Design a protein around this ligand. Structure first.
Ligand SMILES: CCCCCCCCCCCCCCCCCC(=O)OC[C@H](COP(=O)([O-])OCC(O)COP(=O)([O-])OC[C@@H](COC(=O)CCCCCCCCCCCCCCCCC)OC(=O)CCCCCCCCCCCCCCCCC)OC(=O)CCCCCCCCCCCCCCCCC
Ligand SMILES: CCCCCCCCCCCCCCCCCC(=O)OC[C@H](COP(=O)([O-])OCC(O)COP(=O)([O-])OC[C@@H](COC(=O)CCCCCCCCCCCCCCCCC)OC(=O)CCCCCCCCCCCCCCCCC)OC(=O)CCCCCCCCCCCCCCCCC
Ligand SMILES: CCCCCCCCCCCCCCCCCC(=O)OC[C@H](COP(=O)([O-])OCC(O)COP(=O)([O-])OC[C@@H](COC(=O)CCCCCCCCCCCCCCCCC)OC(=O)CCCCCCCCCCCCCCCCC)OC(=O)CCCCCCCCCCCCCCCCC
Ligand SMILES: CCCCCCCCCCCCCCCCCC(=O)OC[C@H](COP(=O)([O-])OCC(O)COP(=O)([O-])OC[C@@H](COC(=O)CCCCCCCCCCCCCCCCC)OC(=O)CCCCCCCCCCCCCCCCC)OC(=O)CCCCCCCCCCCCCCCCC
Ligand SMILES: CCCCCCCCCCCCCCCCC[C@@H](O)O[C@H](CO[C@H](O)CCCCCCCCCCCCCCC)COP(=O)(O)OCC[N+](C)(C)C
Ligand SMILES: CCCCCCCC/C=C\CCCCCCCC(=O)OC[C@H](COP(=O)(O)OCCN)OC(=O)CCCCCCC/C=C\CCCCCCCC
Ligand SMILES: CCCCCCCC/C=C\CCCCCCCC(=O)OC[C@H](COP(=O)(O)OCCN)OC(=O)CCCCCCC/C=C\CCCCCCCC
Ligand SMILES: CCCCCCCC/C=C\CCCCCCCC(=O)OC[C@H](COP(=O)(O)OCCN)OC(=O)CCCCCCC/C=C\CCCCCCCC
Ligand SMILES: CCCCCCCCCCCC(=O)SCCNC(=O)CCNC(=O)[C@H](O)C(C)(C)COP(=O)(O)O
Lengths: 55, 347, 122, 98, 49, 115, 88, 140, 54, 175
């Protein structure tokens, strides 16, 4: 119950699951420049507002 | 390509980078960037194929957008002060444009999307050039304007670069995409310390360039671009695989190897500025890069994968072309930790 | 972020200012130079191993050139590093001397008259 | 500032957004790049003329020269893409992923 | 034994070997002379000997 | 001020000529009359289909050679400088590279149209 | 991902749909076992049109020699299943 | 904008629960809007209405998380008469995590969000108390 | 008794276009051995012209 | 105040930028860019830059002719799109027009910092210099200085042009 299941579940298995999910989210892009440059526009709009107005 | 033409194009790329290096005028720095891109585009397309064409097109679009933003920032800075010298920008908006432009040129997150695709779409020599030489000029420009950068935006981009590099590298079987995500993470590490000490950025640049050169040369020597193709190298060149494994451990930042020293120095320098949380997150995240380096080492050198029958014919042939600097790069990538105090010569 | 690049009277591309000649040069048996020579020897051995040559005995002239080049470069590297540290200490001491009001000398108390708190272990 | 400065800056911003947002044709994006260059030329020329900085009267010419270099580069890449696919659509450039 | 050219034959390239050995010897002599001059200059500047 | 008035007058005259041509005569438009013309027959395909350009490489070179004109047109004013040797050296240097760029594209078969 | 794992029931439903959309067939007198020539009274030319409608529906070409054998909706469903490798 | 963070932090800890809850709701809504914008940009929703629905779901989830966190933290701080205590932020963070888990309808997600969000909120409160810096200025 | 070494089934885990295969990326195919995709049959139609009679 | 001619010219500049940024068929995109180049030439003329405005007009005319040829070669469709033949293009055009309208209104009727800083208007004539001297044009002298002061600029520009020719020939080779 403890060594083979729950201590496994909490520290190592949770880390593996979270990193696998995040890697799948980050790396699964369709390779279309349209989406990338749309995200670039979004990022530019944010930097000029959430950062460029704060100084 | 005619060898003379290739030599001229490589020299033009290098001369554009040096023009960015030696210029005191913003227009000359912009000219250097333009010349570098113009000479760089054909080099990506030396071996013609649709993938190389697509990579060159994406690279050109990204770099042209970055250059437009660069020029617009220069013009704003001129508008609010009749200055052309690269000392310290006088407008926060112009400086934000400059930062976004240089981050897009470097490939920092969230402008990272082009790096893995362009790296995958080109040959290993073009990948080596793109991931080593193309970083010098924007990093030099950022070093010159370090006192003007907004720490919040720069550090946010650096942390995002490290996280996204680790997560993206976790999912790759192609070696070029692995190297591209590793490059993104290393760029994030370098830009994290830039607002505090440019010497640390220069040291990290030198060590990362040495390790990347050694790794790309080892990948050219064992002509593989996928994990399974590299899995065959043990049955033909075990020494190459052992050196690859040691270099991969060095790239992961494990002591007492060389890759550990830049992270160590960056962490201690950041702690000098009462920055504790972010270096901790940075190391805990570079653990992911170490994980996929270890996966590559497992598949390449520490275990023996099945091979094919035709490898016997390859056993009878040596390498016709030899790389002169590969031995030196491996030694510098691994055994230079005891020479740490030499970094004072960089400032 | 750029500490000593703008130091006054700094010639751009010397790598060794004339003032560095007032410092003692590193000894030719300096352990750092020995380590540079060992690095050159390792480079020679790896070069032999990659080219499928006898690792220890194949290229003796090449290994000698490797060791000599590494030692030669390391000597000047050590000279520059020592000179830079000397500059750092010189500037630090000069600044401390010129700003006494930021580095005051306060009288130090003996431990018999400083009251420290005692934390029993139990 | 004069309101013409805001007009030129918004011209640059509109051209940048047009480049960043992609429709099917590759050629449309090259035109947006050329528009950004034109706005940069106009803004820099106005700034230089207003302050009577004599020596930078040549700077916009250099800007135009490197603009021509950029346009030639983009057109060459478009030629190769259209020769590959028979169309200059950006959605055909998806062989490489992240 | 071997069938074809085998560019390294029974004899070594004496030009390349001589150039390598000469380069090493010149570098070592230059380093020795440089160190001697450095020591003498350091002594003369600080008035040791 | 005068040039704007001149341009306005010219454009107004042209537009008025168009208006007169389009509203004065009798119009009898029907589908056969307004159809596309190909000398006796209906076109097979559309006129909006891709039309190959066999001089595509010379078209790109024209862009770079057109900016050579921008760098060379201030030459009459440059001849009035005191350091005539420097200006002449740089003016001759610029044309020499333009001549060499033409020679490179000529010798590498860049001026021949695609087959 | 791509289209779901097409099954026999969907193939049969689509075949009956395209047959009921054919104007020379009774919507309610048509069954999966009906014979075009005998059950529906269709001519050979009519059958060719039906095969063409099947090719439009299922997105793959059918040669004539295979089409001549196909004399009822059940044969069409079986042929599509065999060509698309569908067991259930 | 950090002006939203200041409007949240201008209100005292155990006072004016409705105002602090409103500020936290605004912060959550802004975060959800940014997340939905990036999600739409990188993964097209294949329709305008589906994109509007995805934006709505993301923004509503984030705003609900912020509202629950702020309300619970302020209420606990005022009832316990314990300002400057990380326990209130931990309780609010776990409440927001349970809200997220109920939204996604996943018990494991709910428990994990409870734990991690509460720990993060407690750490943020500790940093506020002792002046930890995330984006430290270059002092030396 | 001998040390275990990877076999074909173990090696095939790294032969896909991407690790951690999901439902969407299952249809991704690894790139060609050389970086050359096969040419597309995008036939460029020639322009047809009526030359005459008028 | 005085006839606001440059204001109208810059508004038409922005209108043409919106026209080719909504991205209709590249024929109409090039037409919009030509209009923008002409009105920018007029703007630069109104501040004394005859040579620079006329030169940019000439350069963009040549570039847009090449672009028209390339559009007919490789960027055509059966039904080329105009600003009213598509919902997306029309929406982008209207959004750009109304954004420019909002910026102009908020600019001249009150004083606000849009993105960088604020401004009240007052026309362009206020910021002039009323300098009275010379048998030459300062723009012409500054441009002619390129052959005496800007040797380095001439060198790098000529090298870049030659390299650009070599680069286009390398890219369009194929094989
Ligand atoms: C400090 C920072 C840290 C280090 C920096 C980062 C390092 C990254 C460097 C990557 C370089 C890439 C590369 O060269 O090949 C990759 C290469 C891998 O390729 P490969 O698999 O071996 O085979 C490729 C073949 O070459 C396949 O190609 P090939 O078959 O066509 O072979 C042709 C070959 C053989 O070459 C020949 O055939 C020779 C024939 C000569 C032709 C004559 C042409 C001359 C006319 C042109 C003049 C242009 C002038 C420009 C004017 C500008 C005006 C402004 O030529 C070459 O391979 C490339 C030649 C490189 C030229 C280097 C010269 C330096 C230029 C300096 C310019 C600066 C000027 C001043 C600037 C002032 C400011 C404005 O990498 C390596 O081999 C090892 C890595 C070595 C890196 C350096 C080591 C670290 C530093 C020490
Ligand atoms: C910290 C304090 C100081 C520590 C020192 C640092 C560590 C050691 C130094 C590192 C660099 C030195 C050696 C590098 C070049 C050698 C390359 C090589 O492959 O060696 C083959 C060669 C044997 O081959 P062979 O004789 O030509 O004929 C056999 C065939 O070749 C048959 O050979 P084969 O190629 O066909 O065999 C295939 C084999 C081929 O695979 C290998 O041979 C592995 C070579 C990996 C290269 C090392 C990476 C580069 C250096 C980084 C070191 C990192 C150290 C930090 C800790 C991390 C540990 C990884 O592949 C495999 O079996 C798969 C193995 C995969 C398992 C994973 C382990 C591999 C990596 C372990 C590296 C550990 C460090 C180096 C240890 C020494 C290795 C020779 O080894 C040697 O004979 C030379 C070794 C040293 C002898 C020189 C000693 C001087 C003589 C005495 C003078 C006394 C001096 C003082 C005077 C006192 C007064 C009396
Ligand atoms: C005081 C600060 C408060 C906190 C602020 C900072 C913390 C923000 C946390 C943001 C968490 C982001 C990750 C969430 C999950 C990933 C996104 C997603 O789709 O989840 C779906 C997931 C449901 O799963 P599903 O839809 O079944 O999954 C579908 C597939 O399995 C898989 O889904 P998929 O494959 O469709 O994924 C969508 C897609 C789309 O990807 C994304 O949506 C990424 C979104 C990143 C947004 C970052 C937000 C940071 C906000 C900063 C401004 C703060 C202002 C205040 O993923 C990708 O394409 C790859 C993404 C990575 C590629 C590049 C990413 C970098 C882009 C830019 C990153 C951020 C740059 C910022 C600007 C940088 C300037 C230098 O959850 C949702 O439905 C949406 C709700 C998400 C939770 C919101 C919680 C907010 C709590 C706020 C509490 C405030 C309390 C009051 C404080 C006082
Ligand atoms: C100096 C530096 C500064 C530079 C920046 C300044 C820039 C100024 C220039 C602006 C002037 C206009 C210039 C014209 C550009 C030409 C664009 C173009 O060519 O369109 C190509 C593009 C694609 O071309 P296409 O291939 O022919 O069409 C295919 C279909 O679109 C796709 O087919 P489908 O139907 O199958 O696909 C499904 C559907 C899916 O469509 C959707 O799902 C989007 C609808 C989501 C609804 C949003 C929620 C509504 C309420 C939110 C309000 C926030 C406050 C709420 C407060 C609390 C509420 C109680 O379509 C899409 O996937 C497209 C998504 C893209 C939507 C717009 C991109 C914005 C970023 C993405 C985030 C989306 C909104 C999230 C919330 C973000 C914060 C507001 O067309 C479009 O996607 C939209 C039409 C373009 C018109 C709108 C453009 C205006 C936006 C420009 C920037 C915004 C303001 C800038 C500054 C403001 C402050 C300073
Ligand atoms: C992996 C280890 C790193 C390897 C690095 C590459 C080694 C090969 C490089 C070849 C050596 C020659 C380079 C320099 C020789 C002459 C040029 C000299 O004049 O440069 C001076 C400067 O000297 C060089 O910068 C020093 C280079 C020494 C690099 C070694 C440091 C490595 C860190 C510690 C690891 C130990 C390495 C062991 C050696 C193999 C100019 O000073 P300055 O113009 O004002 O500084 C420019 C930067 N500023 C303005 C922003 C400050
Ligand atoms: C915020 C970000 C913080 C970043 C923290 C990174 C932690 C570093 C650990 C990286 C683990 C990555 C594991 C992963 O991504 O995949 C799980 C992996 C996938 O298998 P693959 O080999 O990739 O593919 C085989 C099939 N083709 O599945 C496994 O079986 C994993 C087995 C080894 C897992 C080891 C985990 C050990 C963790 C120890 C506890 C501490 C971890 C670090 C976090 C500490 C807690 C704060
Ligand atoms: C730049 C060079 C030329 C400049 C342009 C101006 C040219 C001036 C020439 C004027 C000549 C008079 C024009 C007469 C021809 C007008 C067209 C015409 O013939 O239409 C005939 C038409 C037939 O109609 P129905 O019999 O009812 O229907 C039969 C079919 N069901 O009859 C009419 O409409 C006659 C209308 C009177 C014409 C007006 C002429 C007035 C002069 C205007 C000149 C303008 C100068 C500028
Ligand atoms: C710190 C902030 C705390 C955030 C709370 C959420 C963390 C949840 C992780 C624990 C694991 C719970 C879990 O079940 O993960 C699944 C869950 C998805 O739902 P599924 O369960 O897979 O769907 C079931 C049907 N297929 O995983 C995820 O998508 C979230 C993973 C990312 C966690 C957030 C990491 C953000 C790191 C960047 C911070 C800056
Ligand atoms: C858009 C407007 C278009 C209008 C123009 C169309 C002009 C095209 C005309 C072309 C005519 C031909 O090809 S002529 C076709 C060639 N020969 C024949 O048709 C007669 C011999 N065939 C038989 O006798 C069969 O038995 C049969 C009776 C079919 C029974 O078929 P099933 O029992 O097996 O169903």
């Amino acid at each position: 119950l403890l060594d083979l299941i729950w201590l496994e579940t909490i520290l190592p298995k949770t880390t593996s699951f979270i990193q696998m999910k995040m890697s799948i989210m980050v790396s699964n892009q369709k390779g279309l420049i349209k989406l990338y440059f749309l995200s670039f526009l979004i990022t530019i709009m944010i930097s000029m507002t959430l950062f460029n107005y704060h100084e | 390509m005619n060898p003379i033409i290739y030599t001229t194009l490589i020299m033009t790329v290098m001369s554009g980078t040096m023009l960015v290096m030696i210029s005191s005028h913003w227009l000359l720095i912009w000219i250097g960037f333009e010349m570098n891109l113009l000479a760089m585009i054909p080099v990506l397309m030396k071996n013609f194929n649709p993938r190389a064409t697509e990579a060159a097109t994406k690279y050109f679009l990204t770099q042209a957008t970055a250059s437009m933003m660069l020029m617009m920032a220069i013009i704003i800075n001129l508008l609010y002060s009749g200055q052309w010298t690269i000392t310290k920008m006088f407008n926060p908006v112009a400086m934000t444009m400059m930062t976004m432009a240089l981050a897009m040129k470097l490939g920092l997150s969230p402008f990272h999307f082009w790096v893995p695709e362009v790296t995958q779409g080109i040959s290993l020599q073009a990948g080596l050039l793109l991931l080593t030489w193309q970083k010098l000029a924007p990093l030099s420009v950022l070093c010159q304007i370090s006192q003007s950068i907004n720490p919040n935006l720069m550090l946010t981009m650096a942390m995002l670069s490290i996280l996204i590099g680790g997560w993206g590298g976790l999912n790759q079987t192609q070696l070029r995409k692995i190297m591209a995500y590793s490059s993104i993470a290393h760029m994030g590490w370098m830009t994290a310390v830039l607002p505090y000490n440019t010497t640390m950025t220069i040291l990290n640049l030198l060590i990362y360039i040495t390790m990347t050169l050694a790794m790309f040369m080892l990948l050219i020597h064992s002509s593989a671009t996928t994990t399974l193709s590299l899995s065959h190298t043990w049955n033909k060149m075990p020494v190459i695989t052992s050196l690859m494994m040691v270099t991969l451990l060095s790239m992961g930042g494990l002591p007492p190897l060389s890759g550990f020293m830049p992270k160590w120095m960056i962490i201690q320098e950041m702690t000098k500025n009462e920055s504790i949380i972010m270096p901790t997150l940075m190391a805990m995240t570079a653990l992911l890069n170490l994980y996929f380096y270890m996966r590559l080492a497992y598949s390449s050198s520490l275990t023996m994968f099945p091979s094919t029958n035709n490898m016997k014919m390859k056993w009878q042939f040596e390498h016709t072309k030899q790389m002169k600097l590969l031995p030196t790069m491996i030694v510098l990538s691994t055994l230079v930790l005891p020479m740490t105090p030499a970094l004072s010569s960089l400032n | 972020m750029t500490m000593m690049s703008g130091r006054p009277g700094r010639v751009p591309l010397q790598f060794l200012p004339n003032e560095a000649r007032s410092l003692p040069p590193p000894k030719l048996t300096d352990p750092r130079l020995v380590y540079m020579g060992f690095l050159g020897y390792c480079s020679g051995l790896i070069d032999n191993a990659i080219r499928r040559r006898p690792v220890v005995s194949a290229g003796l002239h090449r290994q000698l050139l490797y060791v000599t080049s590494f030692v030669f470069f390391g000597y000047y590297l050590l000279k520059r590093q020592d000179y830079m540290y000397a500059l750092r200490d010189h500037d630090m001491f000069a600044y401390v001397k010129s700003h006494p009001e930021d580095f005051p000398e306060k009288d130090k108390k003996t431990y018999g008259e400083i009251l420290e708190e005692f934390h029993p272990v139990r | 500032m004069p309101l013409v400065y805001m007009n030129i800056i918004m011209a640059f911003a509109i051209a940048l957004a047009g480049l960043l947002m992609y429709r099917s044709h590759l050629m449309s994006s090259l035109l947006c790049l050329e528009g950004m260059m034109l706005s940069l030329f106009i803004m820099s020329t106005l700034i230089i003329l207003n302050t009577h900085f004599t020596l930078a009267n040549m700077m916009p010419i250099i800007l135009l020269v490197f603009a021509a270099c950029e346009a030639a580069l983009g057109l060459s890449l478009l030629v190769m893409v259209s020769n590959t696919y028979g169309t200059d659509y950006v959605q055909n450039l998806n062989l490489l992923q992240c | 034994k071997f069938y074809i050219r085998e560019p390294p034959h029974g004899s070594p390239d004496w030009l390349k070997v001589g150039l390598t050995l000469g380069t090493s010897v010149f570098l070592w002599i230059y380093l020795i002379k440089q160190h001697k001059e450095d020591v003498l200059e350091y002594k003369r500047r600080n008035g040791l000997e | 001020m005068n040039i704007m008035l001149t341009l306005l007058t010219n454009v107004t005259l042209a537009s008025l000529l168009v208006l007169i041509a389009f509203w004065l005569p009798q119009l009898n438009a029907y589908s056969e009359k307004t159809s596309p013309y190909e000398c006796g027959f209906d076109p097979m395909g559309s006129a909006r289909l891709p039309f190959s350009m066999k001089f595509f490489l010379v078209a790109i070179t024209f862009l770079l050679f057109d900016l050579e004109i921008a760098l060379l047109l201030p030459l009459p004013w440059a001849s009035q400088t005191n350091n005539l040797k420097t200006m002449l050296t740089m003016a001759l240097f610029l044309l020499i590279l333009l001549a060499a760029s033409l020679a490179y594209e000529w010798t590498q078969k860049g001026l021949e149209w695609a087959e | 991902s791509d289209a779901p794992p097409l099954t026999l029931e969907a193939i049969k439903d689509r075949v009956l749909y395209v047959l009921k959309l054919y104007d020379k067939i009774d919507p309610e007198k048509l069954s999966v076992n009906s014979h075009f020539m005998k059950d529906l009274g269709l001519d050979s030319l009519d059958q060719v049109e039906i095969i063409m409608a099947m090719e439009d529906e299922f997105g793959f070409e059918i040669p004539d020699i295979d089409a001549e054998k196909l004399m009822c909706p059940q044969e069409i469903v079986d042929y599509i299943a065999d060509k698309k490798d569908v067991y259930e | 904008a950090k002006t939203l963070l200041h409007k949240y932090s201008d209100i005292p800890e155990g006072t004016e629960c409705h105002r602090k809850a409103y500020a936290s709701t605004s912060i959550g809504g802004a975060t959800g809007l940014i997340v939905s914008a990036y999600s739409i940009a990188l993964k097209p929703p294949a329709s305008f209405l589906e994109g509007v629905a995805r934006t709505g779901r993301y923004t509503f989830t984030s705003a609900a998380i912020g509202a629950i966190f702020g309300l619970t933290s302020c209420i606990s701080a005022q009832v316990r008469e314990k300002p400057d205590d990380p326990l209130n932020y931990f309780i609010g963070g776990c409440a927001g995590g349970l809200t997220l888990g109920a939204r996604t309808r996943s018990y494991g997600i709910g428990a994990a969000a409870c734990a991690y969000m509460g720990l993060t909120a407690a750490l943020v409160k500790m940093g506020q108390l002792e002046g930890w810096q995330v984006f430290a200025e270059p002092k030396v | 008794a001998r040390q275990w070494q990877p076999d074909v089934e173990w090696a095939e885990q790294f032969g896909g276009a991407v690790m951690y295969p999901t439902k969407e990326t299952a249809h991704w195919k690894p790139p060609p051995w050389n970086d050359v995709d096969p040419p597309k049959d995008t036939l460029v139609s020639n322009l047809t012209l009526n030359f005459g009679p008028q | 105040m005085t006839m606001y001619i440059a204001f109208i010219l810059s508004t038409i500049f922005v209108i043409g930028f919106v026209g080719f940024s909504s991205k209709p068929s590249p024929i109409y995109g090039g037409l919009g860019l030509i209009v923008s180049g002409g009105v920018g030439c007029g703007i630069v003329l109104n501040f004394g830059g005859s040579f620079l405005g006329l030169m940019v007009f000439l350069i963009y005319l040549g570039g847009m002719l090449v672009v028209f040829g390339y559009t007919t070669a490789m960027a055509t469709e059966m039904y080329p799109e105009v600003w009213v033949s598509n919902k997306t293009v029309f929406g982008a055009f209207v959004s750009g027009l109304m954004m420019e309208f909002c910026m102009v209104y908020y600019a001249l009727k009150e004083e606000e910092v849009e993105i960088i800083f604020k401004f009240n208007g007052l026309g362009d004539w206020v910021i002039y210099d009323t300098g009275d001297s010379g048998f030459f044009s300062e723009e012409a002298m500054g441009i002619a200085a390129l052959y005496s002061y800007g040797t380095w600029l001439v060198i790098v520009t000529g090298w870049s042009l030659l390299i650009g020719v070599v680069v286009i020939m390398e890219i369009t080779r194929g094989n």
